Design a protein around this ligand. Structure first.
Ligand SMILES: CC(C)CCC[C@@H](C)[C@H]1CC[C@H]2[C@@H]3CC=C4C[C@@H](OC(=O)CCC(=O)O)CC[C@]4(C)[C@H]3CC[C@]12C
Ligand SMILES: CC(C)CCC[C@@H](C)[C@H]1CC[C@H]2[C@@H]3CC=C4C[C@@H](OC(=O)CCC(=O)O)CC[C@]4(C)[C@H]3CC[C@]12C
Ligand SMILES: CC(C)CCC[C@@H](C)[C@H]1CC[C@H]2[C@@H]3CC=C4C[C@@H](OC(=O)CCC(=O)O)CC[C@]4(C)[C@H]3CC[C@]12C
Ligand SMILES: CC(C)CCC[C@@H](C)[C@H]1CC[C@H]2[C@@H]3CC=C4C[C@@H](OC(=O)CCC(=O)O)CC[C@]4(C)[C@H]3CC[C@]12C
Ligand SMILES: CC(C)CCC[C@@H](C)[C@H]1CC[C@H]2[C@@H]3CC=C4C[C@@H](OC(=O)CCC(=O)O)CC[C@]4(C)[C@H]3CC[C@]12C
Ligand SMILES: CC(C)CCC[C@@H](C)[C@H]1CC[C@H]2[C@@H]3CC=C4C[C@@H](OC(=O)CCC(=O)O)CC[C@]4(C)[C@H]3CC[C@]12C
Ligand SMILES: CC(C)CCC[C@@H](C)[C@H]1CC[C@H]2[C@@H]3CC=C4C[C@@H](OC(=O)CCC(=O)O)CC[C@]4(C)[C@H]3CC[C@]12C
Ligand SMILES: CC(C)CCC[C@@H](C)[C@H]1CC[C@H]2[C@@H]3CC=C4C[C@@H](OC(=O)CCC(=O)O)CC[C@]4(C)[C@H]3CC[C@]12C
Ligand SMILES: CC(C)CCC[C@@H](C)[C@H]1CC[C@H]2[C@@H]3CC=C4C[C@@H](OC(=O)CCC(=O)O)CC[C@]4(C)[C@H]3CC[C@]12C
Ligand SMILES: CC(C)CCC[C@@H](C)[C@H]1CC[C@H]2[C@@H]3CC=C4C[C@@H](OC(=O)CCC(=O)O)CC[C@]4(C)[C@H]3CC[C@]12C
Ligand SMILES: CC(C)CCC[C@@H](C)[C@H]1CC[C@H]2[C@@H]3CC=C4C[C@@H](OC(=O)CCC(=O)O)CC[C@]4(C)[C@H]3CC[C@]12C
Ligand SMILES: CC(C)CCC[C@@H](C)[C@H]1CC[C@H]2[C@@H]3CC=C4C[C@@H](OC(=O)CCC(=O)O)CC[C@]4(C)[C@H]3CC[C@]12C
Ligand SMILES: *[C@@H]1O[C@H](CO)[C@@H](O)[C@H](O)[C@H]1NC(C)=O
Ligand SMILES: *[C@@H]1O[C@H](CO)[C@@H](O)[C@H](O)[C@H]1NC(C)=O
Ligand SMILES: *[C@@H]1O[C@H](CO)[C@@H](O)[C@H](O)[C@H]1NC(C)=O
Ligand SMILES: *[C@@H]1O[C@H](CO)[C@@H](O)[C@H](O)[C@H]1NC(C)=O
Lengths: 298, 13, 298, 13
């Protein structure tokens, strides 16, 4: 710092409108404002906090579930457990991605494939496969929850119908995330600069449909419970239904959050809400699965 | 509302 | 993109050595490499994941502690609870800081105070006060753990000694974080570009000393337990001491982690380990406090 | 080993 300039005394500079004369593939002159750079950095800082939260959430729900379980060895326990372990592993590899050479400011501003190196594409593929090993956990948690919900004393017509439709929908979504993943692969390896997000988007719609369906089902069960307990029950549920509606016993909150996800800013680095729906669903699976594995009438 | 968008190497949420 | 350039075909460009002709207070010409910018961004992305982890960890230990507590209303329960609530609040305001105008790439490269606005200095002060309302929680958790550890049947000479020294050390550290906070304030408000980290550093040493002291104490208790139970105990602890040494019942792990914290790279955006010691200590307070509130002999 | 360093507006950990 041999000397400053009068520009430093200017109280109304407002940096954010200035220029960066960087070098790109399009040439050695490419102006960009500090505000766009800071927004690109705030997208990374905004999408890192949520996956740190997910990693810590799943890590500290795994230990609690492990140590507190009164009864173990039931399929739903291991299923939710391995779901949270795939959450932790997905968050780990997504932290690797965030600090990797694909989220770097260099590739964003400067579309130079030479910065990219092989193996990072293997980490991208691995993450896209881990998302499928997570949705598979969720869906083999939900069919193995419906199979306990509707069975036994209940009628085998509504129950078989509900299980059939949920199983068909779930296998269909898993086949969607996969073909999506493979198509994304065949491109990211064919050409690093390409993208394929349509099938990802339709898969997210279909998962939102899966969780909306499960929530609709468990509120239908709540209506049926209240109706039966009114016929000749022990005074019904006295001030005990206040929780069930929206206290994460049911899947209402993720059903709202997915829907509010699309009504945000046009991707101002914040795709958080859809990252919140999956965490809240996988963390609420124990409560709904212990809500469904109940007598429901006495 | 808007479609979700993925960066050229952003894996699935 | 009217047209590309031959530079895009060059397989050996290796971006990271190129130039950014940005504008600073020192002038309108200031070259910096992409690698330094990416390291400044990776410091934010590296220090965001840990505080997302802290926020989710404390949030999901708060609910668990709340619902699972067999016996409530004891002072240590509310003390650890409010400690985790100050963890959540600190993480919230530190997320505000990370996306605020102090961590922005603009201020880092361009030392322009005009980007800074009043109120952000109030958030900086508030965060520095919340750290003191967190250490106070920790230290009034540790004196109220020693007061239960050494009391009653045990001798009043070693116990009173240990309580006295730990209370004196703890009040001394809290007075340190505070004077540190106030001195940092009187500067950040006097001049935004200044810093004061010495007293912060000595406070961190002293807190490491506090937790090392508590760990030393609880292993001394373990030695005393084994000695007494060998004199005429019920076969001592049969394969039950394997946990206690390093399974977070004691405070050994944070005592190691603080010490390993200084032996890292010279601040390559990763001051994580000292951010890990406080989380692990506040999360292990229940285990050590339920280890200390025990008969220890029978 | 090294001293911890604070950015000009980084509050305490
Ligand atoms: C279920 C239990 C474990 C609680 C979970 C709470 C989380 C869902 C919270 C905790 C911290 C929150 C974040 C704290 C701060 C922000 C910044 C906020 O502002 C911006 O990112 C926009 C401005 C900019 O881009 O700089 C957007 C929401 C977000 C990511 C929050 C999203 C929701 C989070 C992850
Ligand atoms: C109590 C429960 C929640 C478990 C606690 C686990 C933490 C100790 C983990 C979870 C996320 C981890 C972090 C995830 C990612 C990174 C970035 C990583 O990258 C770098 O900054 C170094 C890069 C390099 O030099 O290779 C350094 C470790 C760190 C902070 C990790 C440190 C260990 C953390 C905090
Ligand atoms: C550094 C590590 C220890 C952090 C990891 C998070 C901790 C805060 C977790 C991990 C294991 C948890 C414990 C696992 C099991 C239990 C038993 C649980 O009680 C029962 O299972 C029975 C309750 C009843 O019968 O009423 C009470 C909470 C507690 C002590 C948990 C308290 C919170 C702990 C210490
Ligand atoms: C419940 C408990 C047992 C779970 C503990 C899991 C941790 C040991 C995991 C979770 C997140 C992981 C981290 C996620 C991402 C990375 C980045 C990865 O890549 C780099 O740091 C080098 C490349 C670069 O600089 O970007 C190195 C491993 C590391 C730190 C991982 C180390 C292992 C971590 C801390
Ligand atoms: C939650 C528990 C089960 C721990 C999970 C740990 C994983 C997140 C670790 C285990 C092995 C790690 C990998 C081991 C080696 C590498 C190579 C390393 O170096 C490179 O790939 C760069 C150089 C090159 O491209 O050849 C990058 C990180 C990576 C993929 C690591 C990423 C993080 C991984 C998958
Ligand atoms: C975002 C802000 C507004 C905080 C949100 C906090 C919620 C996540 C809390 C508030 C009430 C809590 C519920 C209160 C009581 C219970 C019953 C509890 O199980 C029991 O009925 C037995 C409890 C026991 O006796 O120990 C399981 C957790 C649950 C659903 C809790 C789940 C977490 C809830 C919804
Ligand atoms: C019982 C618990 C688990 C409920 C958790 C509710 C969350 C889904 C809420 C809590 C805080 C909310 C956030 C609070 C503030 C904002 C900022 C808001 O944007 C702005 O105000 C300005 C953004 C900009 O300027 O860029 C967008 C929604 C968002 C991220 C909210 C999204 C929904 C969040 C994460
Ligand atoms: C988004 C919010 C709702 C937090 C998501 C995290 C969940 C995975 C947590 C929140 C409340 C927790 C529950 C709170 C209390 C209990 C009672 C506990 O049983 C006991 O031993 C204490 C009560 C008793 O004595 O019966 C077993 C774990 C469980 C169901 C916990 C399992 C994990 C839950 C569902
Ligand atoms: C601990 C758990 C229960 C979560 C609660 C944390 C709160 C202490 C956080 C959440 C939202 C925060 C607020 C989010 C937005 C702002 C505006 C912000 O505005 C400014 O003065 C700076 C920007 C500007 O100049 O406009 C000042 C901090 C403040 C009040 C924050 C203060 C701290 C709050 C209340
Ligand atoms: C115990 C668990 C369930 C948390 C319960 C409280 C939440 C409702 C709190 C925790 C963290 C809070 C967030 C922490 C930080 C921010 C950034 C804050 O940012 C600003 O006001 C300006 C800067 C920006 O745009 O990010 C907006 C509110 C928000 C999202 C807060 C919204 C409310 C949150 C999600
Ligand atoms: C080794 C690295 C990768 C970390 C692995 C995660 C740890 C944080 C886990 C692994 C084993 C866990 C311990 C296994 C068993 C117990 C007993 C448990 O005891 C009770 O709650 C009641 C008594 C009983 O359950 O027998 C308390 C938590 C604790 C110490 C756990 C605390 C958390 C620990 C240390
Ligand atoms: C129960 C809890 C305490 C388990 C977690 C233990 C932590 C102390 C571990 C988990 C992940 C570890 C980190 C994983 C990866 C790295 C990157 C590593 O980077 C390098 O050495 C330089 C880059 C290279 O490896 O080439 C430095 C150590 C660090 C931060 C590690 C420090 C120690 C950490 C935080
Ligand atoms: C950057 O390029 C433009 C022309 O495109 C030129 O006018 C300017 O002087 C260069 N330097 C800065 C700081 O804008
Ligand atoms: C940019 O490229 C052209 C042709 O390669 C060259 O004539 C020109 O001098 C270069 N300008 C800068 C600022 O590098
Ligand atoms: C930036 O400034 C230097 C002189 O300091 C000059 O040589 C160069 O042409 C300018 N542009 C780039 C991309 O370096
Ligand atoms: C930088 O400032 C000096 C004096 O203000 C001026 O002569 C020069 O043209 C400026 N250069 C650029 C690239 O703005």
């Amino acid at each position: 710092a041999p000397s400053l300039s009068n520009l430093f005394y200017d109280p109304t500079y407002n940096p954010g409108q200035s220029t960066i004369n960087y070098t790109s593939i399009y040439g050695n002159g490419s102006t960009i404002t500090f505000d766009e750079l800071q927004g690109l950095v705030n997208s990374t800082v905004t999408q890192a906090i949520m996956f740190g939260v997910r990693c810590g959430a799943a890590a500290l729900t795994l230990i609690v579930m492990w140590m507190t379980s009164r009864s173990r060895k039931t399929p739903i326990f291991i299923i939710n457990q391995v779901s949270l372990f795939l959450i932790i592993l997905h968050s780990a590899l997504y932290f690797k991605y965030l600090l990797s050479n694909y989220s770097s400011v260099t590739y964003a501003l400067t579309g130079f494939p030479q910065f990219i190196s092989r193996g990072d594409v293997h980490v991208y593929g691995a993450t896209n496969i881990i998302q499928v090993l997570l949705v598979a956990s969720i869906e083999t948690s939900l069919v193995f929850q419906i199979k306990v919900i509707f069975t036994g004393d209940n009628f085998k017509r509504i129950g078989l119908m509900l299980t059939s439709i949920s199983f068909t929908l779930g296998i269909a979504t898993v086949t969607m995330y996969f073909v999506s993943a493979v198509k994304g692969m065949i491109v990211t390896y064919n050409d690093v600069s390409a993208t394929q997000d349509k099938y990802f988007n339709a898969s997210t719609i279909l998962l939102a449909s899966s969780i909306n369906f499960m929530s609709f089902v468990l509120v239908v069960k709540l209506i049926l419970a209240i109706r039966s307990r009114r016929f000749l029950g022990l005074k019904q549920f006295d001030s005990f239904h206040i929780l069930l509606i929206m206290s994460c016993q049911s899947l209402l909150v993720p059903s709202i959050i997915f829907i509010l996800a699309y009504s945000l800013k046009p991707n101002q680095g914040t795709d958080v809400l859809t990252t919140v729906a999956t965490l809240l669903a996988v963390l609420s699976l124990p409560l709904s699965s212990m809500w469904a594995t109940a007598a429901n009438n006495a | 509302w808007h479609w979700l968008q993925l960066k050229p190497g952003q894996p699935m949420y």
